[PDB]
């Protein structure tokens, strides 16, 4: 007898994983090849990712996109979980660059457009890969990029930041190696910049055998630009590799960049850069894979009305506000400066003590997760329900610190009052004391 799961005959080991090995497989009838990621259930219990594994399976299985590895099926056994995925024969992009050296400009751009399309698709679905690098970018027989190994990925939540140490130092953003909080799309963009550099130069932009030197090189953002590099893509690299995450290029910026726009196929970015819906986008949906796959009429109709809405340019100002001729009639006759939470120049220990005694003064219940992190709950004296908020002390500068208020969604059914206003009133009581 052989080793056979889901009619596939398990072959040689492609690669190893922290939880389990990845093994090629071959259909006993058609000879179709897949990649089977074996997850030992007792191992995923030892370090408890069981919820994280459950989530990764959900998201990856819903994903469809040419340049992301597809998850065909997840087969469960008493001792093991089998993830059946598409198989690409070209292997790692890293190995291809090792063997063949640097790719020319047109081939580097062709692959980078495919890779960034996958990265964009992940961000639209609120997923950050966090592991992006040539080792995790595979190739098929036709040299199409395939993004793999979402094991280190994460699902982004509203109002939350990610401090988790991830990936590799060479591909890690300056804020990642510094342990600073980040949103995470800007980190995938940094990694994509290093991939783009590796495609063009055949070497890594930040590398050193001395680890402290390497971490300084990354935080300095200084890398060598070879003479043969197009100044256009150099400007693109400088923007993606910006140390400041607020000055770092977005995917919208890259799509607008002239070097990226050249030769770009339409299937890679069928959608507007915005990750939020527009009136025009919904219009097509109301009229009732195709966007990312080769064109089909049902897919074609979508672009048809999108291009028809664009040519006129008369419908865009309706659904959203542009930031910078005829003034809007209601904007003509009508400055307050907003700020985040409340600031204190006192000691971090003193301001946390003042908060805690004020939480107690208001008869609020609170749990201490971190010295600077608090989770506070207030019972509404009217509706007899509970209002939750999280408190985090941040450091603005040397002498300045900031208390951050953040609302927490409840799990309740339709409920009395306003969840947003109840959050404001709860903060209002505390702010009144602290001010």
């Amino acid at each position: 007898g052989s080793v056979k799961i889901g009619h596939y005959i398990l072959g040689d080991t492609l690669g190893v994983g922290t939880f389990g090995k990845v093994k090629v497989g071959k259909h006993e009838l058609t000879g179709h090849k897949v990649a089977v990621k074996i997850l030992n259930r007792q191992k995923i219990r030892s370090l408890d990712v069981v919820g994280k594994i459950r989530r990764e399976i959900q998201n990856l299985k819903l994903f469809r996109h040419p340049h992301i590895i597809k998850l065909y099926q997840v087969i469960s056994t008493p001792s093991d979980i089998f993830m059946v995925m598409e198989y690409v024969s070209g292997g790692e992009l890293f190995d291809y660059i090792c063997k063949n050296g640097r790719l020319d400009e047109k081939e580097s751009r062709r692959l980078f457009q495919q890779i960034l399309s996958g990265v964009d698709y992940c961000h639209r679905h609120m997923v950050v890969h966090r592991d992006l690098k040539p080792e995790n970018v595979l190739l098929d027989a036709h040299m199409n990029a395939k993004i793999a190994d979402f094991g280190l990925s994460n699902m982004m939540s509203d109002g939350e930041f990610l401090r988790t140490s991830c990936g590799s130092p060479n591909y890690a953003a300056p804020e990642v190696i510094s342990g600073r909080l980040y949103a995470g799309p800007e980190v995938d963009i940094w990694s994509s910049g290093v991939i783009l550099y590796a495609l063009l130069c055949g070497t890594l932009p930040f590398d050193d055998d001395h680890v402290p030197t390497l971490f300084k090189k990354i935080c300095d953002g200084i890398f060598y630009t070879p003479q043969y590099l197009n100044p256009s893509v150099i400007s693109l690299l400088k923007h993606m590799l910006q140390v400041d995450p607020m000055k770092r290029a977005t995917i919208k910026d890259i799509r607008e960049h002239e070097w990226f726009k050249q030769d770009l196929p339409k299937y890679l970015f069928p959608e507007d850069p915005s990750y939020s819906s527009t009136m025009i986008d919904d219009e097509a949906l109301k009229e009732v894979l195709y966007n990312r796959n080769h064109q089909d009429p049902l897919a074609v109709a979508y672009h048809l009305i999108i291009d028809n809405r664009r040519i006129m340019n008369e419908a865009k100002d309706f659904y959203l506000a542009t930031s910078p001729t005829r003034p809007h009639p209601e904007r003509v006759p009508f400055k307050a400066k907003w700020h985040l939470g409340i600031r204190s120049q006192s000691r971090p220990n003193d301001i946390m003590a003042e908060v805690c005694r004020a939480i107690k003064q208001l008869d609020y219940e609170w749990k201490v997760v971190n010295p600077y992190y608090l989770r506070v709950r207030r019972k509404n004296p009217v509706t007899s329900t509970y209002s939750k908020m999280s408190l985090q002390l941040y450091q603005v500068d040397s002498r300045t610190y900031l208390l951050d208020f953040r609302s927490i969604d409840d799990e309740l059914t339709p409920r009395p009052g306003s969840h947003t206003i109840e959050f404001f009133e709860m903060c209002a009581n505390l702010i009144k004391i602290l001010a």
Binding site: T322, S323, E330
Partner: protein, 168 residues
């Protein structure tokens, strides 16, 4: 259908020959395929109890790390119960589960109400918010005995920045 349920029999150790004998195969010798120090066969088994034993380099033995049953005749076999909950992925994962202040992220320093918008559009409209900015409390310095609080929240694909005017 439910009568074929994939079950992994894995022997961890060395050997020239490793066989699997169980109640399912009528105690015959099924050769296990080796991958370094692991010998494996995957069998589709009916629901319910099965007893099995390994033949390793001429020695009949059982897996000490796996459940066993001892017969009144002194026979020691490994025993496995094939159960439906193991073959549903999310049911299997359901039973498996059962210092200085952090530097302020610059993302939160983007204030949607401080952002100025073109004069040619509705004053009620706002730019598209970053998802990390959602649910965070923003405020105005208390003036005239009135405190103003604001936060941006999401309703399905739409966002609403709510301002509350409350007196102190």
């Amino acid at each position: 259908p439910a009568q074929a349920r994939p079950t992994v029999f894995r022997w961890t150790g060395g050997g020239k020959e490793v066989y699997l004998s169980g109640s399912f195969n009528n105690w015959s010798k099924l050769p296990l395929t080796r991958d370094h120090n692991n010998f494996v066969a995957i069998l589709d088994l009916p629901e319910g109890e099965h007893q099995y034993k390994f033949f390793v380099d001429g020695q009949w033995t059982h897996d000490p790390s796996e459940p066993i049953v001892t017969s009144q005749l002194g026979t020691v076999n490994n025993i496995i119960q094939v159960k439906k909950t193991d073959f549903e992925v999310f049911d299997a994962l359901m039973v498996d589960s059962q210092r200085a202040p952090p530097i302020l992220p610059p993302h939160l320093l983007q204030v949607i109400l401080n952002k100025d918008t073109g004069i040619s559009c509705d004053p009620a409209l706002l730019p598209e918010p970053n998802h990390v900015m959602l649910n965070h409390l923003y405020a105005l310095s208390i003036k005239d005995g009135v405190m103003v609080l604001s936060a941006t929240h999401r309703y399905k694909k739409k966002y609403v920045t709510t301002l509350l005017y409350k007196p102190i």
